[PDB]
Design a protein around this ligand. Structure first.
Ligand code: FPS
Ligand code: MG
Length: 341
């Protein structure tokens, strides 16, 4: 089982966040989800390496899923740090993969291919529209939501009805991806080349140059745009509440709930916060421990989400050009929560 051990070891190095939450899952589901994550993590590593040619990515990505059945395949000159190691010693992942149930392998192979092609689409173009924003989030996060949902059903832990309509699963992925895209604006725009995800359709209403938000000079417009991004992410909350409330298994529930509650805490902190444009805004380690502790069942999770949702709303004024748009979004979220209390 050295292969699985490497997997969990690389997981811990490549992503401390997920590597903690994944431990909420029972061993069998956990192995499948851990391997699933590393496969996608490998894709991400190819998509994000800006020192390697795009034609190289459009070439390798589409057939990434095919390598899942080739225990000798690996990549040598891509990525930084442990990610690089993930690809070079990618054998451990494919081996572990070959020892998974037939149904788990197919979900993983299926999501891997669709995400890869989606990444290819956006490797050759920008995110101009809100539609673009949403679709890109779908490919790199919404699909993880689909995949996980299909792994839950396939495992037997959740009812087959869960996979009927995957819309809410996609919403779950979008809420997480969007909160991170919002939180990581500065860090992303400060890289070489600069990484940009905020959709032009949204930011062109406050500026002609996104890079202007880095200057205190345009602090007001940056914050108004930041607030419009938050409003856009809040659209997903009522759906996150529905998906979480449809879960019956405690392991699946905690694994699914924790990241969502963390996202809402981050979102409540970045909202109307100009610090977002010069540093990473993060929750305290104590709030994190508390979230991990209580998000084991629906009721407590709903109240923590309500609490954070109420903190977000409390942070604004009738002066802000969002107060209107944010208010009904907060009410929809809180309403959806009380709808299960
Ligand atoms: C359960 C369900 C239906 C949907 C959830 C969808 C999921 C799990 C999406 C993962 C997408 C994100 C935000 C990845 C960043 S890697 P990271 O999480 O390791 O670490 P970081 O964001 O850098 O802190
Ligand atoms: Mg990426």
């Amino acid at each position: 089982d050295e292969d699985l051990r490497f997997c969990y070891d690389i997981l811990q190095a490549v992503s401390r966040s997920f590597a903690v939450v994944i431990m909420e899952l029972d061993e069998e589901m956990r192995d499948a989800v851990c391997i699933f994550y590393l496969v996608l993590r490998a894709l991400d590593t190819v998509e994000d390496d800006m020192s390697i040619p795009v034609e190289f990515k459009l070439r390798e990505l589409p057939k990434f899923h095919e390598h899942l059945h080739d225990t000798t395949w690996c990549m040598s000159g891509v990525g930084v740090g442990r990610e690089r190691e993930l690809l070079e010693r990618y054998t451990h992942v494919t081996r572990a993969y070959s020892r998974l149930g037939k149904a788990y392998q197919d979900v993983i192979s299926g999501i891997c291919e669709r995400m890869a092609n989606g990444m290819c689409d956006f490797l050759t173009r920008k995110v101009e529209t809100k539609a673009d924003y949403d679709l890109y989030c779908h490919y790199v996060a919404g699909l993880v939501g689909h995949g996980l949902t299909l792994l839950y059903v396939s495992s037997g832990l959740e009812d087959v009805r869960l996979a009927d309509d995957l819309t809410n699963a996609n919403h779950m992925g979008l809420f997480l991806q969007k909160t991170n895209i919002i939180r990581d604006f500065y860090e992303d725009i400060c890289e070489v080349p600069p990484r940009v995800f905020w959709p032009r359709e949204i930011w062109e209403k406050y500026t002609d140059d996104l890079h202007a938000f880095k200057d205190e000079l345009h602090e007001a417009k940056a914050v108004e745009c930041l607030n419009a991004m938050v409003a856009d992410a809040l659209v997903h909350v009522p759906h996150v509440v529905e998906y979480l409330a449809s879960l019956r298994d405690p392991s699946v529930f905690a694994f699914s709930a924790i990241p969502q509650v963390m996202a809402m805490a981050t979102l409540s902190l970045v909202f109307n916060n100009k610090d977002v444009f010069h540093t990473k805004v993060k929750t305290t380690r104590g709030a994190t421990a508390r979230i991990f502790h209580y998000s084991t069942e629906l009721q407590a999770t709903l109240q923590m989400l309500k609490t954070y949702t109420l903190r977000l709303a409390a942070r604004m004024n009738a002066q802000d050009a969002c107060y209107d748009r944010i208010e009904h979004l907060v009410n929809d979220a809180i309403r959806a929560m009380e709808s299960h209390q």
